[PDB]
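DATA SHEET
Item: assembly model
Revision: 1
Owner: S.N.
Input lines:
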Amino acid sequence: MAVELNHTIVLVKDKDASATFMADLLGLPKPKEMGPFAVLQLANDVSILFMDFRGEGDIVPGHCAFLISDEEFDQIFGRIREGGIEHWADQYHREPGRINDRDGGRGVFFEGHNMEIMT
Amino acid sequence: HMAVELNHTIVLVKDKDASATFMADLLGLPKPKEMGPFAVLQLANDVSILFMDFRDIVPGHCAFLISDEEFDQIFGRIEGGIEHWADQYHREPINGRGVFFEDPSGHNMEIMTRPYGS
Amino acid sequence: MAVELNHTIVLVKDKDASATFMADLLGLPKPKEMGPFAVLQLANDVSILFMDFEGDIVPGHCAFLISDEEFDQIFGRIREGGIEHWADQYHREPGRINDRDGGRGVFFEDPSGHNMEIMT
Amino acid sequence: HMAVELNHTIVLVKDKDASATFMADLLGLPKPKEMGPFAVLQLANDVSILFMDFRDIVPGHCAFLISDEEFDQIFGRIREGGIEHWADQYHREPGRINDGRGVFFEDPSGHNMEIMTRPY
Ligand SMILES: [Fe+3]
Ligand SMILES: [Fe+3]
Ligand SMILES: [Fe+3]
Ligand SMILES: [Fe+3]
Ligand SMILES: [Fe+3]
Ligand SMILES: [Fe+3]
Ligand SMILES: [Fe+3]
Ligand SMILES: [Fe+3]
Ligand SMILES: [Fe+3]
Ligand SMILES: [Fe+3]
Ligand SMILES: [Fe+3]
Ligand SMILES: [Fe+3]
Ligand SMILES: [Fe+3]
Ligand SMILES: [Fe+3]
Ligand SMILES: [Fe+3]
């Protein structure tokens, strides 16, 4: 296939709080705001468009997952395990304080939108 | 030292199988793969949608980039009774080019082109 | 990596003959003219921008990935049109296709003499 | 029944090794592969550039789509490295990026390149 996912809208309680937190943690530039969206651009020709929503939001095992460097993981995990960010090895948030080693890589789930970083 | 990528996202829909089959069918993608509670669709830019059964409101949507030729083909099929709108808020029942529509679960989608010089 | 090839400019003796011929054979819509270029858009988020300037030294070539069904169609049109074709990038094996590497391939000329390839 | 894709194109340059290593380094790609007379660079959208020795004429170029963060990184090193650049494909606006965003410059072999963004 050639079709690409170009952008996807993510509903969260506070779009500005979500986007800046993720850009900071992921080491990305300041998010750009356009209309009702806070835009987080990723490297693979895709952006996440955060939008304010009062309702549900995210339920496990739902999540958004970011593929990163293992050098990036050790830094991001350090800040997670520095700034007191609750985290889990699993998408169901049943294993707090652990990382997984799924594909011989490393991975961790965190944050109220559900996130995942993986190598 | 790679730059950060969005690798996959889980999308909650009333019917993950209806959603996945319609999306793979319409976009020309291979048959969805079943993995745990998810129906998984792979896109070309190293990112996956994982549909999961649950219970979208506009202007939420997921948007797929295609060539103009694929846009004309897919929209030709959308020869079809699929409701469609030019805008993410579904107030204009097309607008590069783009068009918005719903899948059988009510999940909001968009197809769009980005031609040279766009 | 995530970096994509978004467009590339291809030098040909006649940009509109090359673009029109290639769009027709490949089953694509009529090429669009943009600035100094005749544009051939392909499906994988990349376009070929033909420009007047040959443009090619063998084994130089531009290669298109296509369906098995479309390969049979296009190659039939290649023989139906009397278009010269070769199994190899060096144009040393005229009149045949190859079946290398789990697929099929054939090399041919556009009207500018530019070296082309279709492959499955 | 896939739609037609551009799978690879071979690029004539003065030095295939200089061009390919330069391009992979700057774009953050893996080490180029050597295959016959070619140095092969794979891009993410299912297309490869195959560099070949030939011992660029504006406005021809190959254009690379990257994120805004990757653009600022690559251009900063272009700025720190004195590589010389232009805002335009005809190279009439030197020392400037354009505004997505774009910047044009050459590689060691003189191959014409471009990095570009297309943000939401
Ligand atoms: Fe704001
Ligand atoms: Fe999410
Ligand atoms: Fe995941
Ligand atoms: Fe390092
Ligand atoms: Fe990737
Ligand atoms: Fe969606
Ligand atoms: Fe959209
Ligand atoms: Fe793309
Ligand atoms: Fe060529
Ligand atoms: Fe080839
Ligand atoms: Fe066949
Ligand atoms: Fe068929
Ligand atoms: Fe492909
Ligand atoms: Fe080039
Ligand atoms: Fe360009």
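QC remark: DSSP finds two helices and seven strands in chain D.
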